Design an enzyme around this catalytic site. Structure first.
Site, PDB file in Angstrom:
ATOM      1  N   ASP A  44       0.848  -1.193   0.000  1.00  0.00           N
ATOM      2  CA  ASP A  44       0.000   0.000   0.000  1.00  0.00           C
ATOM      3  C   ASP A  44       0.889   1.251   0.000  1.00  0.00           C
ATOM      4  O   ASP A  44       1.688   1.445   0.928  1.00  0.00           O
ATOM      5  CB  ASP A  44      -0.907   0.026   1.237  1.00  0.00           C
ATOM      6  CG  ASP A  44      -1.847   1.226   1.146  1.00  0.00           C
ATOM      7  OD1 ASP A  44      -2.819   1.165   0.360  1.00  0.00           O
ATOM      8  OD2 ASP A  44      -1.584   2.247   1.867  1.00  0.00           O
ATOM      9  N   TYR A  49       3.009  10.117   0.672  1.00  0.00           N
ATOM     10  CA  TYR A  49       3.954   9.539   1.615  1.00  0.00           C
ATOM     11  C   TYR A  49       5.406   9.914   1.310  1.00  0.00           C
ATOM     12  O   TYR A  49       6.282   9.729   2.158  1.00  0.00           O
ATOM     13  CB  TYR A  49       3.844   8.000   1.696  1.00  0.00           C
ATOM     14  CG  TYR A  49       2.468   7.503   2.085  1.00  0.00           C
ATOM     15  CD1 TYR A  49       1.481   8.324   2.636  1.00  0.00           C
ATOM     16  CD2 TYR A  49       2.137   6.160   1.878  1.00  0.00           C
ATOM     17  CE1 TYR A  49       0.216   7.831   2.938  1.00  0.00           C
ATOM     18  CE2 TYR A  49       0.886   5.661   2.169  1.00  0.00           C
ATOM     19  CZ  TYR A  49      -0.092   6.489   2.704  1.00  0.00           C
ATOM     20  OH  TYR A  49      -1.353   5.992   2.966  1.00  0.00           O
ATOM     21  N   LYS A  78      -2.506   5.935  -4.528  1.00  0.00           N
ATOM     22  CA  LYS A  78      -3.617   6.835  -4.248  1.00  0.00           C
ATOM     23  C   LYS A  78      -3.347   8.191  -4.881  1.00  0.00           C
ATOM     24  O   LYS A  78      -2.198   8.627  -4.980  1.00  0.00           O
ATOM     25  CB  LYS A  78      -3.826   7.003  -2.725  1.00  0.00           C
ATOM     26  CG  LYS A  78      -3.750   5.701  -1.958  1.00  0.00           C
ATOM     27  CD  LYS A  78      -4.184   5.814  -0.505  1.00  0.00           C
ATOM     28  CE  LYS A  78      -3.865   4.577   0.301  1.00  0.00           C
ATOM     29  NZ  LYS A  78      -2.411   4.481   0.643  1.00  0.00           N
ATOM     30  N   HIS A 111      -7.657   9.304  -2.528  1.00  0.00           N
ATOM     31  CA  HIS A 111      -7.150   9.177  -1.159  1.00  0.00           C
ATOM     32  C   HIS A 111      -8.167   9.709  -0.123  1.00  0.00           C
ATOM     33  O   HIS A 111      -8.300   9.131   0.963  1.00  0.00           O
ATOM     34  CB  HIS A 111      -5.789   9.869  -1.044  1.00  0.00           C
ATOM     35  CG  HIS A 111      -4.898   9.400   0.069  1.00  0.00           C
ATOM     36  ND1 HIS A 111      -3.517   9.405  -0.120  1.00  0.00           N
ATOM     37  CD2 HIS A 111      -5.137   8.973   1.316  1.00  0.00           C
ATOM     38  CE1 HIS A 111      -2.998   8.970   1.040  1.00  0.00           C
ATOM     39  NE2 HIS A 111      -3.937   8.699   1.940  1.00  0.00           N
TER      40      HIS A 111
HETATM   41  N1  LIG Z   1      -5.999   5.812   3.212  1.00  0.00           N
HETATM   42  C1  LIG Z   1      -5.595   6.569   4.244  1.00  0.00           C
HETATM   43  O1  LIG Z   1      -6.007   7.701   4.481  1.00  0.00           O
HETATM   44  C2  LIG Z   1      -4.599   5.932   5.186  1.00  0.00           C
HETATM   45  C3  LIG Z   1      -4.457   6.484   6.483  1.00  0.00           C
HETATM   46  C4  LIG Z   1      -3.617   5.837   7.379  1.00  0.00           C
HETATM   47  C5  LIG Z   1      -2.931   4.713   7.022  1.00  0.00           C
HETATM   48  N2  LIG Z   1      -3.019   4.227   5.712  1.00  0.00           N
HETATM   49  C6  LIG Z   1      -2.219   3.046   5.277  1.00  0.00           C
HETATM   50  O2  LIG Z   1      -2.313   2.062   6.287  1.00  0.00           O
HETATM   51  C7  LIG Z   1      -0.978   1.713   6.727  1.00  0.00           C
HETATM   52  C8  LIG Z   1      -1.003   1.235   8.154  1.00  0.00           C
HETATM   53  O3  LIG Z   1      -1.442   2.287   9.046  1.00  0.00           O
HETATM   54  P1  LIG Z   1      -0.421   3.140   9.951  1.00  0.00           P
HETATM   55  O4  LIG Z   1       0.903   3.258   9.277  1.00  0.00           O
HETATM   56  O5  LIG Z   1      -1.161   4.390  10.300  1.00  0.00           O
HETATM   57  O6  LIG Z   1      -0.253   2.325  11.308  1.00  0.00           O
HETATM   58  P2  LIG Z   1      -0.266   0.792  11.838  1.00  0.00           P
HETATM   59  O7  LIG Z   1       0.016  -0.134  10.721  1.00  0.00           O
HETATM   60  O8  LIG Z   1      -1.507   0.647  12.640  1.00  0.00           O
HETATM   61  O9  LIG Z   1       0.916   0.882  12.898  1.00  0.00           O
HETATM   62  C9  LIG Z   1       2.286   1.081  12.438  1.00  0.00           C
HETATM   63  C10 LIG Z   1       3.156   1.154  13.682  1.00  0.00           C
HETATM   64  O10 LIG Z   1       3.078  -0.123  14.386  1.00  0.00           O
HETATM   65  C11 LIG Z   1       4.418  -0.605  14.594  1.00  0.00           C
HETATM   66  N3  LIG Z   1       4.376  -2.052  14.501  1.00  0.00           N
HETATM   67  C12 LIG Z   1       4.195  -2.793  13.363  1.00  0.00           C
HETATM   68  N4  LIG Z   1       4.175  -4.103  13.585  1.00  0.00           N
HETATM   69  C13 LIG Z   1       4.359  -4.209  14.923  1.00  0.00           C
HETATM   70  C14 LIG Z   1       4.448  -5.350  15.743  1.00  0.00           C
HETATM   71  N5  LIG Z   1       4.401  -6.596  15.274  1.00  0.00           N
HETATM   72  N6  LIG Z   1       4.651  -5.105  17.054  1.00  0.00           N
HETATM   73  C15 LIG Z   1       4.723  -3.859  17.542  1.00  0.00           C
HETATM   74  N7  LIG Z   1       4.634  -2.702  16.845  1.00  0.00           N
HETATM   75  C16 LIG Z   1       4.469  -2.945  15.510  1.00  0.00           C
HETATM   76  C17 LIG Z   1       5.282   0.083  13.558  1.00  0.00           C
HETATM   77  O11 LIG Z   1       6.623   0.151  14.011  1.00  0.00           O
HETATM   78  P3  LIG Z   1       7.925  -0.073  13.058  1.00  0.00           P
HETATM   79  O12 LIG Z   1       7.562   0.396  11.679  1.00  0.00           O
HETATM   80  O13 LIG Z   1       8.960   0.774  13.773  1.00  0.00           O
HETATM   81  O14 LIG Z   1       8.232  -1.549  13.132  1.00  0.00           O
HETATM   82  C18 LIG Z   1       4.621   1.460  13.447  1.00  0.00           C
HETATM   83  O15 LIG Z   1       5.074   2.302  14.513  1.00  0.00           O
HETATM   84  C19 LIG Z   1      -0.174   2.979   6.435  1.00  0.00           C
HETATM   85  O16 LIG Z   1       1.212   2.804   6.502  1.00  0.00           O
HETATM   86  C20 LIG Z   1      -0.719   3.345   5.075  1.00  0.00           C
HETATM   87  O17 LIG Z   1      -0.131   2.464   4.119  1.00  0.00           O
HETATM   88  C21 LIG Z   1      -3.860   4.831   4.840  1.00  0.00           C
HETATM   89  N1  LIG Z   2      -4.173  13.968   9.190  1.00  0.00           N
HETATM   90  C1  LIG Z   2      -4.660  12.914   8.498  1.00  0.00           C
HETATM   91  O1  LIG Z   2      -5.703  12.326   8.811  1.00  0.00           O
HETATM   92  C2  LIG Z   2      -3.828  12.426   7.314  1.00  0.00           C
HETATM   93  C3  LIG Z   2      -3.436  10.966   7.465  1.00  0.00           C
HETATM   94  C4  LIG Z   2      -2.520  10.521   6.311  1.00  0.00           C
HETATM   95  N2  LIG Z   2      -2.026   9.156   6.498  1.00  0.00           N
HETATM   96  C5  LIG Z   2      -2.243   8.385   5.401  1.00  0.00           C
HETATM   97  O2  LIG Z   2      -1.801   7.261   5.222  1.00  0.00           O
HETATM   98  N3  LIG Z   2      -3.056   9.079   4.517  1.00  0.00           N
HETATM   99  C6  LIG Z   2      -3.298  10.322   4.989  1.00  0.00           C
HETATM  100  O3  LIG Z   2      -3.967  11.183   4.461  1.00  0.00           O
HETATM  101  C7  LIG Z   2      -1.428  11.531   6.058  1.00  0.00           C
HETATM  102  C8  LIG Z   2      -0.285  11.206   5.348  1.00  0.00           C
HETATM  103  C9  LIG Z   2       0.629  12.175   5.057  1.00  0.00           C
HETATM  104  F1  LIG Z   2       1.742  11.822   4.356  1.00  0.00           F
HETATM  105  C10 LIG Z   2       0.472  13.474   5.411  1.00  0.00           C
HETATM  106  C11 LIG Z   2      -0.670  13.807   6.110  1.00  0.00           C
HETATM  107  C12 LIG Z   2      -1.618  12.859   6.470  1.00  0.00           C
HETATM  108  O4  LIG Z   2      -2.686  13.275   7.210  1.00  0.00           O
HETATM  109 CL   LIG Z   3      -1.570  10.306  -2.295  1.00  0.00          CL
END
Ligand SMILES: NC(=O)c1ccc[n+]([C@@H]2O[C@H](COP(=O)([O-])OP(=O)(O)OC[C@H]3O[C@@H](n4cnc5c(N)ncnc54)[C@H](OP(=O)(O)O)[C@@H]3O)[C@@H](O)[C@H]2O)c1
Ligand SMILES: NC(=O)[C@@H]1C[C@]2(NC(=O)NC2=O)c2cc(F)ccc2O1
Ligand SMILES: [Cl-]
EC number: 1.1.1.21
Length: 316
Positions: A44, A49, A78, A111
């Site tokens: 993803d 990013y 996205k 997005h």
């Molecule tokens: N569409 C949107 O608006 C949107 C918004 C938010 C997120 N996303 C996508 O969803 C993905 C995941 O969400 P997120 O990055 O917000 O957070 P997440 O996946 O809920 O949490 C990531 C965090 O958890 C830690 N972690 C991972 N595996 C672990 C484990 N086994 N044990 C302990 N800690 C662990 C990571 O540390 P380390 O990396 O240091 O190991 C990092 O600090 C994003 O990266 C992005 O691709 C999309």
């Molecule tokens: N404040 C929010 O809710 C969003 C979250 C968010 N994370 C993610 O993966 N999608 C998003 O749009 C994000 C990522 C960025 F790189 C910069 C800003 C940002 O803000």
């Molecule tokens: Cl984007």
């Protein structure tokens, strides 16, 4: 548990993918290489990013290495809010393709439903602080997304952070050519999303759960916020199953017919997070995890709460 879910475009999508928001550019190439080596087939990504070039180095190396074939990968990116403009959508997609070293995306998402003024800044501001919107109707952005399918740049299109009324608007679009394949939304035991998930699934839209671990590295985290990974009730379920809390948090959405995209740059955790196909949560476990819902959001896009299309004033 099967590894892939069928989308409404006829393609299959891996239910486990690697998230890349916040993955540092000097760490994400190794993270994606390790992920592919230990079994991940879905990454993803997003232009906002600021690390797609480095993700792409990893993908290309693994393709060149013949560790995987392109047809076996499922790469998602996205369209950022400053590219809602029908005449900017193709160039935004092509920049992402160029950065990722790809000739097509498996899935390209809007997005957010909120369009912003185009320009260099990702969050363009007025002098007094607020997000400067764009005037482009999101039905028009959807039509621009459909053109990408018809040009061969993307195999599927979808949406992210759309509330059910916004999903409905797309589904009711006059002349709709392609339904959204996916709605990617925040989902975890503190934000269980029952109402929005049921809506999407009834319409044959697959839901991807983001921030499944509660995003402990989110840059606005505070001490007093609730912590999934440290919640003793979740750790107890993990202990009963001889798994980690993260493994329970990843398996949870899988058993709701969701796709899930935990982020890590730590090689051991990347491998950890993938070993979730060998155990089952009971129905009682699932209902217990659902009971933890607090309507607590990681990602509330708080600079945009007066955008006409801000998604989170609606109940769902
Ligand atoms: N569409 C949107 O608006 C949107 C918004 C938010 C997120 N996303 C996508 O969803 C993905 C995941 O969400 P997120 O990055 O917000 O957070 P997440 O996946 O809920 O949490 C990531 C965090 O958890 C830690 N972690 C991972 N595996 C672990 C484990 N086994 N044990 C302990 N800690 C662990 C990571 O540390 P380390 O990396 O240091 O190991 C990092 O600090 C994003 O990266 C992005 O691709 C999309
Ligand atoms: N404040 C929010 O809710 C969003 C979250 C968010 N994370 C993610 O993966 N999608 C998003 O749009 C994000 C990522 C960025 F790189 C910069 C800003 C940002 O803000
Ligand atoms: Cl984007």
């Amino acid at each position: 548990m099967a590894s892939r879910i069928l989308l409404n475009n006829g393609a299959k999508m891996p239910i486990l993918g690697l998230g890349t928001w916040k993955s540092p550019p000097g760490q994400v190439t190794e993270a994606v290489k390790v992920a592919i080596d230990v079994g991940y087939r879905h990454i993803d990504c997003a232009h906002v990013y600021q690390n797609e070039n480095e993700v792409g180095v990893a993908i290309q190396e693994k393709l060149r290495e013949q560790v995987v074939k392109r047809e076996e990968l499922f790469i998602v990116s996205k369209l950022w809010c400053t590219y809602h403009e029908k005449g900017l959508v193709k160039g935004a997609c092509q920049k992402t393709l160029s950065d990722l070293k790809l000739d097509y995306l498996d899935l390209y998402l809007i997005h957010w439903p909120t369009g912003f003024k185009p320009g260099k800044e990702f969050f363009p501001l007025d002098e007094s602080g607020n997000v400067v919107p764009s005037d482009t109707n999101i039905l028009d952005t959807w039509a621009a997304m459909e053109e990408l399918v018809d040009e061969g740049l993307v195999k599927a299109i979808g949406i992210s952070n759309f509330n059910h009324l916004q999903v409905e608007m797309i589904l009711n679009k006059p002349g709709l050519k392609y339904k959204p394949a996916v709605n990617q939304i925040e989902c975890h035991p503190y934000l269980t999303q029952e109402k929005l998930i049921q809506y999407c699934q009834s319409k044959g839209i697959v839901v991807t759960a983001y921030s499944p671990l509660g995003s402990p590295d989110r840059p606005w985290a505070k001490p007093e916020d609730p912590s999934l990974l440290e919640d003793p009730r979740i750790k107890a379920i993990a202990a009963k199953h001889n798994k980690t809390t993260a493994q329970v948090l990843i398996r949870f959405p899988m058993q709701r017919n969701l796709v899930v995209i935990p982020k890590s740059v730590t090689p051991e955790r990347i491998a950890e997070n993938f070993k979730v196909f060998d155990f089952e949560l009971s129905s009682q476990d699932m209902t217990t995890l659902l009971s933890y819902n607090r309507n607590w959001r990681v990602c509330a896009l708080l600079s945009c709460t007066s955008h006409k299309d801000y998604p989170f004033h609606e109940e769902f």
